[PDB]
Design a binder for this molecule. Structure first.
Ligand SMILES: CC(=O)N[C@H]1[C@H]([C@H](O)[C@H](O)CO)O[C@@](O[C@H]2[C@@H](O)[C@@H](CO)O[C@@H](O[C@H]3[C@H](O)[C@@H](O)[C@H](O)O[C@@H]3CO)[C@@H]2O)(C(=O)O)C[C@@H]1O
Ligand SMILES: CC(=O)N[C@H]1[C@H]([C@H](O)[C@H](O)CO)O[C@@](O[C@H]2[C@@H](O)[C@@H](CO)O[C@@H](O[C@H]3[C@H](O)[C@@H](O)[C@H](O)O[C@@H]3CO)[C@@H]2O)(C(=O)O)C[C@@H]1O
Ligand SMILES: *[C@@H]1O[C@H](CO)[C@@H](O)[C@H](O)[C@H]1NC(C)=O
Ligand SMILES: *[C@@H]1O[C@H](CO)[C@@H](O)[C@H](O)[C@H]1NC(C)=O
Ligand SMILES: *[C@@H]1O[C@H](CO)[C@@H](O)[C@H](O)[C@H]1NC(C)=O
Ligand SMILES: *[C@@H]1O[C@H](CO)[C@@H](O)[C@H](O)[C@H]1NC(C)=O
Ligand SMILES: *[C@@H]1O[C@H](CO)[C@@H](O)[C@H](O)[C@H]1NC(C)=O
Ligand SMILES: [Ca+2]
Ligand SMILES: [Ca+2]
Ligand SMILES: [Mn+2]
Ligand SMILES: [Mn+2]
Lengths: 239, 239
């Protein structure tokens, strides 16, 4: 594909154009629930991933060009016990066939097996990290944050994010190919607060020609559970 | 129009789909020069405005709906004397036939006659203010800033903007109709710095059904002159 664009205003149960991994799924009410919820209550140690069914062409060696893209989606992270929550969700690009790694992966938002930034992971992600205690996440700044990750959970760049328990967030992620710059942005219309981050990233150097795009999220200790619900999602890429 | 979308990757001299006001124009090199430049040096007390030729439908009383839009553009503000510059540029929406007001309008970025927030102005703008001394701009915060204006030069909301003399900026402005939220964002791929702001705005309440969209900029005292050049511009609105 040289141009791919899709808009999902309302998710549908077992949505055909979505590849589900782990405990992810969309509720009868139309929300993409990354982590498991029962009776409206988020469940402990849940890991989920949803990907758009069609692989996306990120670059062409025959062409020499690289894709520029932009994604926007709305989500809610509602926790019964706000004080300390875990772990957060993230939008990411990975190889078409990636699976959730085996092992302790909650503090890695379901994207990694460990802290390392292994070049083989081939993963570019934008995380919305809700857990930052150094006892379990020693690589995190001391506050909830939005970070840009490249082959590793230790964000190459972050910004402080003032999460609103149950607040509806509108986030857009944009990649300017010509400028190898990935920028992330989040807004809470309810508080009129904004957050943003940018980092240099050369997709040609990190990701393969084809990749699948989507979301990943994880839940940890029971007293810190929160939801990772996505309500809308639009994606556009142009090669 | 129920949907309008245009992308201008390169401006052309006397570009037919652009309405020029004041000293605005596009150079032979293809840059939209809001304020006049001669021999590559910005001139004092210059005021310019450029608008897309076609008026945009912002809302429909017969339909009940309101337009959601998003604009992205790249610009450069190069000043020979960085220390203190004036005045800045801005993207704005106004009535189809608005003209540059008469009088001292440089500290108002070519958008207003005075400080007042007169409901009759019908102007929603996002300013990139480079001059903030309280002696002439008593309404400004104490730093260069990006602010959201509504019928007046005194921004209803701002954020600190760390201008880069001659740096190429990529800015996007988005209006979420359903949430009456106008958000502004700027990034300098060269420093990987980001800035963003959001504010509650009800276009139905401020602007008329039809409006023209574009840019405004002004230059002041000779020792503080700077350029207000726009390189790219894409606009999309959907009713
Ligand atoms: C094999 C296995 O099941 N590993 C778990 C780990 C283990 O708890 C860990 O290996 C024990 O050393 O926990 C995992 O989730 C943890 C993760 O969410 C972190 C931070 O993101 O928080 C941990 O919860 C803490 C909690 O924050 C404290 O307040 C509490 O006192 O202790 C809790 C730990 O018991 C989560 O357990 C992990 O990803 O490492 C999930 C693995 O499956
Ligand atoms: C009638 C008229 O021509 N008005 C000018 C005004 C006049 O200078 C003002 O009415 C005198 O009180 O200036 C206008 O531009 C000014 C504006 O750009 C402000 C701030 O944005 O800066 C002024 O320059 C200052 C400069 O910053 C100082 O360092 C310097 O010492 O004094 C300068 C003023 O002389 C600009 O003049 C204006 O918008 O008010 C342009 C009007 O056309
Ligand atoms: C392009 O890349 C594909 C796989 O990455 C390879 O099989 C093909 O031979 C390459 N062709 C060129 C011209 O690089
Ligand atoms: C990552 O997955 C591999 C499977 O090849 C497994 O051997 C390894 O234990 C996992 N990493 C961790 C930290 O468990
Ligand atoms: C925007 O408004 C709609 C309808 O009023 C609401 O359902 C939605 O959650 C809001 N979105 C955001 C990001 O606040
Ligand atoms: C500019 O302000 C003056 C008063 O200072 C006013 O008389 C004039 O009408 C305004 N300009 C325009 C175009 O209305
Ligand atoms: C992005 O890269 C292009 C090509 O190198 C350049 O012309 C443009 O000014 C850059 N934009 C930004 C915001 O740096
Ligand atoms: Ca964390
Ligand atoms: Ca000012
Ligand atoms: Mn983190
Ligand atoms: Mn200002």
């Amino acid at each position: 594909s040289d141009e791919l664009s899709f808009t999902i205003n309302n998710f549908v149960p077992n949505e055909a154009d979505l590849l589900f991994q782990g405990e992810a799924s969309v509720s009868s009410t139309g929300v993409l629930q990354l982590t498991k919820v029962e009776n409206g209550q988020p469940q402990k140690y849940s890991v989920g991933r949803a990907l758009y069914a069609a692989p996306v062409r990120i670059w062409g060696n025959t062409t020499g060009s690289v894709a520029s893209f932009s994604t926007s989606f709305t989500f809610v992270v509602k926790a019964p016990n706000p004080d300390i929550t875990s772990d957060g969700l993230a939008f990411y690009l990975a190889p078409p066939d990636s699976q959730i790694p085996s092992g302790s992966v909650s503090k890695y938002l379901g994207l990694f097996n460990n802290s390392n930034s292994d070049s083989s992971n081939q993963i570019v992600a934008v995380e919305f990290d809700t857990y930052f205690a150094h006892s379990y996440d020693p690589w995190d700044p001391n506050y909830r944050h939005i970070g840009i990750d490249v082959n590793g959970i230790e964000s190459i760049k972050t910004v402080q994010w003032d999460w609103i328990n149950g607040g509806v967030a509108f986030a857009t992620i944009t990649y300017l190919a010509p400028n190898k710059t990935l920028i992330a942005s989040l807004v809470y219309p309810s508080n009129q607060t904004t957050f943003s981050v940018a980092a240099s990233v050369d997709l040609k150097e990190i990701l393969p020609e084809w990749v699948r795009v989507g979301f990943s999220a994880a839940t940890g200790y029971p007293t810190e559970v929160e939801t990772h619900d996505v309500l809308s999602w639009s994606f556009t890429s142009t090669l």
